[PDB]
């Protein structure tokens, strides 16, 4: 795990603590996708929705994936590559989720699904790079996208952000492996 891996884990933990103390809403006032056009110039909001988690399990699960895949990507292809996947995936996963959900969504799984698709397809097309997804985690990835289609867990899953993140990941793997 390099500095981008670390910093992101720090930022998410800081933001999570903030959320338990002040409550989720107060942090979301600052960090949620813009709900109102008065806030459209608050550029950070297109990304910061990725830093909010709504339970200990939520942040643990997201961060374990982030640490494993983000660390793999930073170790092999550099900080700059992890930053670009992360920033584009956050923006577009956020863009799609807000269409269905407005501001009421958050977490790093749009980004993690980008890392999934990215590491999966690059490792398929370009084994040379030395990054790949174990089929176990490929299978896990697909099941939760498919699980999302049926609104299980009282419609608690950001299906838009997952599929968008995967599309971005696959896309940038394709372009990169050309």
The two three-digit tokens of residue 55, written as one number: 């339970």
Classify residue 65 as exposed, middle or buried by CB count within 10 Å of its CB (0-12, 13-18, 19+).
Answer: buried
For 61, the token pair is 């699960």
- Provide the CA 13 distance to its chain's centre, in angstroms: 15
Structure resolution, Å: 2.4
Rounded to whole angstroms, the Cα distance separating 138 from 123 reads 12
Q: At what angle do helices 135-149 and 159-176 cross, to 10 degrees?
A: 140
CA distances from 78 to 3, 9, 39, 70 (A): 10, 17, 33, 10
Per-position DSSP letters for the chain, written without gaps between them = --HHHHHHHHHHHHHHHHHHHH-HHHHHHHHS--SSGGGTT-TTHHHHGGG--SSHHHHHHHHHHIIIIIHHHHHHH-HHHHHHHHHHHHHHHHHHHHHHHTT----SHHHHHHHHHHHHHHHHH-GGGS----HHHHHHHHHHHHHHHTT-TTT-S-HHHHHHHHHHHHHHHHHHT-
Active site residues: 109, 162
CA distances from 68 to 130, 158, 160 (A): 15, 21, 23
Give how far Cα 166 sits from Cα of 48, 116, 151, 160, Å. Answer: 19, 7, 19, 10
Q: Which domain holds residue 111?
A: 1-178
The CATH number assigned to the domain holding 168 equals: 1.20.1540.10
> Method of determination?
X-ray
Q: How far apart are CA 78 and CA 146, in angstroms?
A: 32
Instruction: Please count the structural domains in the chain.
Output: 1
Buried b vs exposed e over 9-32: b needs ≥16 C-beta within 10 Å?
beebeebbebbeeeebeebbeebb
Residue written as token pair 């990725």: 50
């Amino acid at each position: 795990a390099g500095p981008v891996t670390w910093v992101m884990m720090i930022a998410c933990v800081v933001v999570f603590i903030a959320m338990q103390i002040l409550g989720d809403q107060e942090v979301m006032l600052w960090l949620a996708w813009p709900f109102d056009p008065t806030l459209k110039f608050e550029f950070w909001r297109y990304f910061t929705h990725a830093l909010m988690h709504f339970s200990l399990m939520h942040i643990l699960f997201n961060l374990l994936w982030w640490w494993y895949l983000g660390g793999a990507v930073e170790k092999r292809l550099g900080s700059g590559k992890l930053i670009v996947i992360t920033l584009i995936s956050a923006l577009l996963s956020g863009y799609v989720q807000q269409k269905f959900s407005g501001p009421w969504f958050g977490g790093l799984s749009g980004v993690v699904y980008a890392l999934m698709g990215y590491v999966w397809l690059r490792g398929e097309r370009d084994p040379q790079s030395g990054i790949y997804l174990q089929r176990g985690l490929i299978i896990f990835a697909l099941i939760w996208i498919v699980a999302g289609w049926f609104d299980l867990f009282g419609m608690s899953m950001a299906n838009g952000a997952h599929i968008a993140g995967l599309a971005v990941g696959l896309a940038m793997a394709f372009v990169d492996s050309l």
